[PDB]
Structures are given as structure tokens and as C-alpha cells.
Design a protein around this nucleic acid. Structure first.
Length: 49
DNA sequence: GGATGTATATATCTGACACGTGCCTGGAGACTAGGAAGTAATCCCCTTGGCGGTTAAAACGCGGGGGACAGCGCGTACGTGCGTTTAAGCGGTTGCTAGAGCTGTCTACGACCAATTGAGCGGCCTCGGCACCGGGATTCTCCAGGGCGGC
């Protein structure tokens, strides 16, 4: 709603526990498929990538 | 029949015990002040038993070669013994000076106490420098028009 209706489509950050974060990723894949939701975990080279 | 080995007795040497004396240092008695024990409050660090996630260190295995160790040869340098020298060790001279010990006098220097104040500790405001944001100048990629060729 913040992205589509009010046009506030800037950088949002969601900080979650690691164990629940696949349950956030598939929720973003299902409910908001048009969004550019990215994932930020891993070692130094993955985060650099 | 003479001299030798051995036992008991007597005088002398020597470490130890007790007596005597000084003196000075430790003990007894009394008084006082402050060092430390005890109390309460506040705040921060440490303890024990857990969880989660990163990740680099620890562990394990394996191949291989460098290094530890053993053996052997050799030659030199150190041990050993003897003869010779030399200097240490002891006893001794001869004076003077340094130093410990004791006594005496005195004076400058440091302890002690009261009043003071200025250097040390904490916080607050500001600057030097680094960094975030807005505006101007410079260079790169691109879309369209003009001209030429083919059926």
C-alpha cells in the first residue's frame, strides 16, 4: 500500500530473525510479486555481490 | 739372675658452672587520641546457566623430504707425570693516618599547625577539519535528413 497507493516506493528495510526470514521471502514472493524485494545475508563476498 | 709389659695412683691441663657487677633496655602502670571495626546507601562488575549466528581456528589424514642420530675415522689438543723455578705464606720493622668509640656543644633544618589559595579534575562551548548537499561547467551517445542504388 505504501508503494502503490501513496507512491512511497523508496528504500524500505525489514529487519527479521534469520529463522523466520524464508517465511518472509515466500510471503513477499506471493503477496507482492511486482516488488524488488532483495535479501541481505551471507558472507563478505555474497554481501559484496 | 736381669729387664720388659702392664696395672693403679698422683699431679697437671682444660672446658664448664656459678658468683659478681654494671647498665641499659625491656616491662609495669597510667592516659589519651585516632585507626579501624561496624553500619547504611548507591551503583557497577562478576557468576551460572542458557540461546543464536559467523567464522576462523583447530583437528585429522597423508605424502615426503629434511633433519636427528648412529657409526667410523682421524688428528689434535688436553691430560699426566716429572724436574725446575718462583712466589705465596709466615713472621717482622717503622712510622703515620684512617676510623670506631666516646663525650660535649650548638645551630640550622625539618616536623607541626593554622590560614590560604591555586593547581588538578570534571563538564560546557567553541574551532579545525572532515563530510553531506545544491549548483555551474564540460564531454559522450544518439535520431533524423540528404544522397545513391535497384526493379
Amino acid at each position: 500500500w505504501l508503494i502503490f497507493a501513496r507512491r512511497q516506493n523508496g528504500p524500505h528495510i525489514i529487519v527479521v530473525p534469520l529463522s523466520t526470514m524464508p517465511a518472509w521471502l515466500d510471503t513477499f514472493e506471493k503477496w507482492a510479486p511486482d516488488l524488488n524485494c532483495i535479501c541481505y545475508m551471507g558472507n563478505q563476498k555474497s554481501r559484496d555481490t
